[PDB]
């Protein structure tokens with residue numbers, strides 16, 4: 432199991448533009464196009480991201496490309512965030528995947544904000560962190576996914592995903 436498989440599970444795959452849990456225009460593997468309410472804008476954005484006139488639809492391959500670029504970026508934002516870096520650096524491999532998941536789903540910034548639980552992860556306070564992480568808008572809006580991640584942070588294993 433690894434990052435890609437993980438996220439692929441959490442985010443699914445759609446070849447046609449859709450609205451996410453928050454109602455935003457998204458595509459492929461959790462690839463967010465826009466916060467705006469215009470399907471057109473979303474279309475523009477897509478074309479631009481794909482490099483062509485898509486008409487709201489893309490190929491699997493394209494979807495995948497987006498995905499790598501996205502995983503890549505997530506990591507990098509992590510590597511560039513003065514708050515994230517240290518944490519990540521101190522984590523074992525499995526757990527990093529978890530931090531990356533969150534970052535992918537909510538943004539560096541978003542994540543950069545879980546100060547306390549980040550602190551907890553740093554000191555390796557698994558159980559406390561999990562509780563902490565649970566008290567969030569994030570958990571409350573996407574309970575099942577949040578659970579997987581949290582479990583993940585908690586045990587250092589892929590069971591949540593098995």
Ligand SMILES: [Cl-]
Nearest residue numbers: 573574575576
């Ligand atoms: Cl969920």
